[PDB]
Ligand binder design. Structure first.
Ligand SMILES: *P(=O)(O)OC[C@H]1O[C@@H](n2cnc3c(N)ncnc32)[C@H](O)[C@@H]1O
Length: 627
DNA sequence: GCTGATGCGTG
DNA sequence: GTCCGACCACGCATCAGC
């Protein structure tokens, strides 16, 4: 009986403690109950162990279900390059809940808003055979495949069929998954650790009943932890280089974990998660961490991280940092390929930054202009916003992976085999030096050239390419490394930890000329959970039925509740920015823009100030002219 | 065709 | 101080209802 399944028990037996028989399908209730126990236990090690116990039973009894169970635990539909999206959110899901329960959409919306979790609405109110893990996962991909006119009704029909067959907590987790907020607490890192733990304790490919159910039975605590850690590194190193569960899992099941590296090798065509950098507080922190290792300084470009794959045989593909295929977004980049390599180059993987380039002015354009590029089936002749590629690394070249070579070798191979064209393809502006004064000028020269600052990377000491890692061998020297008193004019309903309260707030400045409150930004960060739930009733007491006449929000997201303008909060932010959405100081710096706060954060209540004593809009413009 | 509502993606 | 999972703003893309 799956309703009593307990993958959080000590001395978990993969066969006897499972809630289904060998050879039959894993029931979705087993996955749901695992999700329940993962959320109950209060330690990450226990959450991994609980998920591992489910995978051990899946490996021992139902190997062909391992892939769906992994994808359901990750709330994904397949490999990232395939670009499958459900096309459903809270809107489509609430329509299905209202139809499945025969209730009005408004009453279902209000209940979902009050509880901040659509999964609770679908569960608390709802014969068909029990749901299976592979069955539910197949329905998820069916919903994703439906597009075009009248496709919403077809999606809701599949969703409705899921809710009628749900039992116990199944409907809460199907609803949360379909909405894109499963909130399991485990993701790629933990799910991979659970997988390696499972196949280590209960090896795959055994004849039923498995003679080996717990390979760590006799080990001491320290030896067991060390052995699991070492096995986890084998799976995570191979996955970093071939992040495709559709390729990894069949080979893992047929040849085991320790033989898995000999079958999966890095090659062009499969996107990789790029190497990332850690922020630094200044140049002195950079030299302290790098000590004496020689490093290089490159411009910190403001564009899209673009991984360019050239397969042996001419095929070129462009991937995003999240491993989505963007080849169709960049027809201009494809046509540029023969102009950027010597004829001797036949295959590679480039690490570049695609930056919007004003071809008439020969200048770099900010990231916002880049987002206005079309995404859907782009024609090169219709491209309005050209791009210049700024290449700075080389992962693969002519059949050989370079990830283990030092950056000085990879940089050299990049310069020796690829050719530069102005405003199209160039190497990142770089400086090799140790002089603190010289570095400081390069950073100022960088922001003058319309960049965010400097990236600093070691050349030979700890200078390998670390896939899917925010490394400490790369450092950011960012320009952004203001305090304002704003009025709270609206509240947004909260989800997750803020389910029974407010999740965000709409802030506004004071316009002296018109005596109006002008929306300036949304705020939801900087609060402690205590000072939010303790003072929630104070703000709820200010709810109005209608917006006050002097409150002006223009294109901002209309609040879930208008609040009586009375609360003034001290708010900090990184910088200000021109915004086409917010009306604060709309005609003071630009003719039709307006100023908003980038990354605002709550600091303190200002109960001594009234709304008309807030930071004026004129003061917002004055701060923008300086920044 | 038009439009308000609704969904996706990354830096 | 480090690691990890969740979240998001603002751009474009999609679609019901008429
Ligand atoms: P900031 O904290 O805004 O980071 C900018 C992102 O862009 C990537 N990036 C820009 N320029 C480079 C160079 N020259 N080399 C490597 N990466 C770069 C950063 O990795 C940040 O993700």
């Amino acid at each position: 009986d799956p309703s009593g399944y307990n993958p959080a028990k000590n001395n978990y037996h993969p066969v006897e403690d499972a809630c289904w028989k060998p050879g039959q399908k894993v029931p979705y209730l087993a996955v749901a109950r695992t999700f329940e126990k993962i959320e109950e236990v209060s330690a990450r090690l226990r959450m991994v162990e609980t998920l591992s116990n489910l995978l051990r039973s899946v490996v021992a009894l139902s190997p062909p279900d391992l892939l769906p169970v992994l994808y359901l635990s990750l709330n994904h539909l397949g490999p990232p390059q395939q670009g499958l999206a459900l096309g459903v959110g809270d809107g489509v899901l609430l329509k299905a809940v209202a139809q499945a329960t025969g209730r009005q959409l408004e009453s279902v919306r209000a209940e979902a808003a009050e509880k901040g979790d659509v999964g609770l609405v679908a569960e608390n109110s709802r014969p068909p055979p029990p749901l299976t893990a592979s069955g539910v996962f197949s329905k998820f991909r069916d919903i994703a495949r439906l597009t075009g006119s009248a496709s919403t009704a077809k999606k809701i029909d599949i969703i409705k069929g899921l809710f009628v067959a749900c039992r116990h907590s199944e409907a809460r987790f199907i609803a949360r998954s379909l909405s894109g907020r499963l909130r399991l607490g485990l993701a790629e890192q933990s799910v991979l650790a659970a997988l390696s733990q499972a196949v280590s304790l209960t090896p795959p490919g055994q004849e039923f009943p498995p003679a080996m159910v717990d390979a760590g039975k006799g080990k001491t605590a320290e030896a067991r932890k060390t052995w699991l850690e070492e096995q986890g590194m084998i799976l995570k190193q191979t996955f970093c280089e071939v992040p495709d569960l559709d390729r990894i899992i069949p080979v893992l099941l047929e040849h085991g974990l320790e033989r898995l590296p000999e079958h999966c090798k890095l090659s062009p065509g499969i996107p990789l998660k790029p190497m990332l950098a850690h922020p630094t507080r200044g140049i002195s922190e950079v030299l302290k961490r790098f000590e004496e290792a020689a490093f290089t300084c490159e411009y910190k470009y403001d564009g899209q991280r673009a991984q360019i794959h050239a397969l042996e045989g001419g095929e070129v593909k462009i991937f995003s940092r999240n491993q989505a295929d963007n080849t169709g977004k960049y027809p201009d980049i494809i046509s540029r390929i023969p102009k950027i390599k010597l004829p001797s180059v036949t295959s590679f993987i480039l690490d570049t930054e695609a930056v919007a380039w004003d071809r008439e002015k020969k200048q770099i354009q900010p990231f916002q202009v880049l987002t206005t590029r079309k995404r859907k089936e782009v024609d090169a002749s219709e491209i309005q916003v050209q791009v210049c590629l700024y290449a700075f690394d080389l992962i693969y070249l002519n059949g050989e992976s370079l990830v283990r070579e030092p950056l000085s070798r990879r940089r050299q191979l990049l310069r020796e085999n690829f050719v530069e064209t102005e405003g199209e393809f160039v190497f990142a502006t770089s400086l090799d030096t140790k002089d603190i004064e010289q570095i400081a000028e390069f950073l100022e020269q960088s922001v003058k050239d319309s960049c965010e600052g400097l990236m600093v990377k070691t050349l030979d000491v700890d200078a390998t390419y670390e896939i899917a890692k925010r490394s400490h061998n790369w450092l950011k020297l960012k320009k952004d490394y203001d305090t304002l008193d704003l009025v709270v004019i609206g509240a947004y309903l909260g989800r997750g930890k803020r389910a029974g309260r407010y999740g965000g707030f709409l802030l506004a400045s004071y316009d002296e000329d018109s005596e109006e409150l002008q929306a300036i930004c949304k705020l939801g960060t900087g609060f402690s959970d205590e000072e939010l739930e303790e003072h929630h009733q104070s703000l709820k007491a200010l709810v109005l039925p209608s917006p006050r006449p002097y409150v002006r929000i223009d294109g901002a997201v209309i609040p879930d509740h208008w609040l009586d303008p009375s609360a003034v909060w001290e708010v900090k932010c990184a910088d200000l920015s021109l915004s086409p959405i917010y009306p604060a100081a709309r005609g003071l710096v630009d003719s039709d823009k307006g100023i908003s706060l980038r990354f605002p954060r709550f600091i303190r209540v200002r109960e001594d100030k009234q709304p008309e004593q807030a930071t004026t809009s004129a003061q917002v413009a004055c701060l923008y002219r300086k920044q």
